Ligand binder design. Structure first.
Ligand SMILES: [Cl-]
Ligand SMILES: [Cl-]
Ligand SMILES: [Mg+2]
Ligand SMILES: [Mg+2]
Ligand SMILES: [Mg+2]
Ligand SMILES: [Mg+2]
Ligand SMILES: [Mg+2]
Ligand SMILES: [Mg+2]
Lengths: 296, 295
């Protein structure tokens, strides 16, 4: 019940502890990519050009709120392909719309060609297929698991089962497989394609997202959130659960430091940058305001 | 003696089997190949690894291929050409897994993997199977003397099994096996790698226990039982129970999948155990079936 329906009492302390953790384990700050107004407008118009078959209009402010994760969580010091950057901007945004849509509106025949059109505009032939398959797999997974028994089992059993589901469902495998062309770094490209890149970063992305999206998701009956494993109405059990998740994040980050310099740079900018964006998006500042729910 | 799980061999085998009978229930069935299929498979295996210069005996091929014969899901098979492809791809990449890396020639071996995939698979599936084979052999190579491998295999069971999702080859297996079944739900789980992540621990814990002696004699660190002091019967006992607990949890969550997919997942884990307990490979440290000869 409502005594369990929000993580608001822990908002300030957990935000502080998240930042404390990154300052002591990552150290290097994330950094915005600033697109021009023309580049931002190109991205947005391509976004509108992808969801228009599905019928709905999406405001500039909604697009800008979706695209911030790409602006904050890539690795600017290592970028070599700004066309691949813009592709990740568009692909991220249009599949976030899909993630927010009611499944009865998931028209694959109309939407999948639009995803391919994006990948072919921005990527070479081989990259286009890799980016497109991951986009296809991501939107199919989100459709697949709406009120699936599989999701219920994997989210309610253990943190191990839940994070295993999230390697795909949170979109990080997709992210890696559309982002390696930005960097054109051979080791990073191989970790992206084995999905080791996604598995190394899944928990740090997921735990942060789950904390700040918890209120919205429970109000909408969405079960894919690790803090639904613990009783968030008891401070003691919550704090103990939360420390376990910080420990998870720390172990991952320290193992990431065994990767080569450029690769760990990208991995860590992703995790820390997602945190910075997540704490500045109004999507995650009520259960249900007008920038995150709508309609069903 | 410190690198051997020999004192634990009988009890752990019994406990493994008891676990499967209780939690899986239905046993695996071994695929019978005719003489012509088996000779087609071995001929293509030899043709594929010939440019790497190391002869491989029929007996060695048969030892590699048994895992495919035992760990697929016979009552759901629809495409025996894809089945034969998995036989060949499994065996040739197992030889690669047993090669000194100085003999890894990607320029000679990668086109042999492509030629196998194009023979047995439709056009999309040949790409999916080829990429996963490429991913597997490249990973085995690039992690051979690697601080990344050291970190993931020494830190925690959690980091270890994360590396094994790729390293043991199960993601490869799923991406080349889905065409055998033509089951739409199974094909998607294969392509997201959820299939692989559900089955990794049950495959890895079994294989690790029985390949431990061989691996530590060859200086191979990719084995979860190197996380515990196998010379401490109390510490080993507690560790082994924790790994059984991991297998049980995975298996009970697999049962939430649709009936066919769950048959394929559980046949894979249990069939692998049945094959492993009768593979000669695992019966010495290094024997001249599974020798990767060196130095
Ligand atoms: Cl959900
Ligand atoms: Cl190894
Ligand atoms: Mg989602
Ligand atoms: Mg969502
Ligand atoms: Mg969320
Ligand atoms: Mg190996
Ligand atoms: Mg091996
Ligand atoms: Mg082994």
């Amino acid at each position: 019940d409502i005594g369990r329906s929000s993580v608001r009492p822990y908002l300030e302390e957990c935000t502080r502890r998240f930042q404390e953790m990154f300052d002591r384990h990552v150290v290097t700050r994330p950094t915005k990519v600033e697109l021009t107004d023309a580049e931002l407008r190109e991205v947005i118009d391509d976004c509108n050009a992808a969801v228009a078959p599905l019928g709905k209009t999406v405001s500039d402010e909604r697009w800008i709120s979706y695209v911030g994760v790409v602006l904050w969580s890539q690795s600017p010091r290592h970028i070599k392909d700004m066309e691949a950057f813009k592709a990740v901007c568009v692909l991220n945004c249009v599949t976030a719309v899909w993630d927010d849509m009611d499944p009865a509106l998931h028209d694959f025949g109309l939407f999948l060609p639009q995803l391919r059109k994006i990948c072919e505009k921005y990527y070479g032939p081989e990259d286009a297929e890799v980016a497109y398959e991951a986009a296809r797999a991501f939107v199919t997974s989100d459709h697949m698991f709406r009120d699936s028994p599989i999701k219920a089992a994997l989210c309610t059993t253990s943190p191990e089962q839940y994070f295993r589901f999230r390697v795909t469902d949170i979109g990080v495998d997709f992210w890696m497989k559309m982002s390696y062309p930005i960097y054109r770094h051979p080791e990073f490209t191989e970790h992206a394609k084995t999905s080791l890149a996604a598995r190394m970063t899944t928990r740090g992305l997921t735990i942060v997202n789950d904390f700040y999206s918890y209120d919205r998701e429970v109000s909408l009956g969405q079960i894919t959130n690790c803090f639904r494993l613990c009783d968030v109405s008891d401070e003691t059990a919550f704090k103990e659960f939360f420390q376990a998740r910080l420990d998870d994040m720390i172990e991952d980050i320290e193992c990431i430091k065994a990767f080569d310099q450029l690769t760990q740079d990208v991995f860590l900018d992703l995790i820390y940058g997602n945190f910075v964006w997540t704490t500045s998006n109004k999507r995650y500042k009520t259960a249900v305001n007008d920038v995150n729910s709508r309609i069903q």
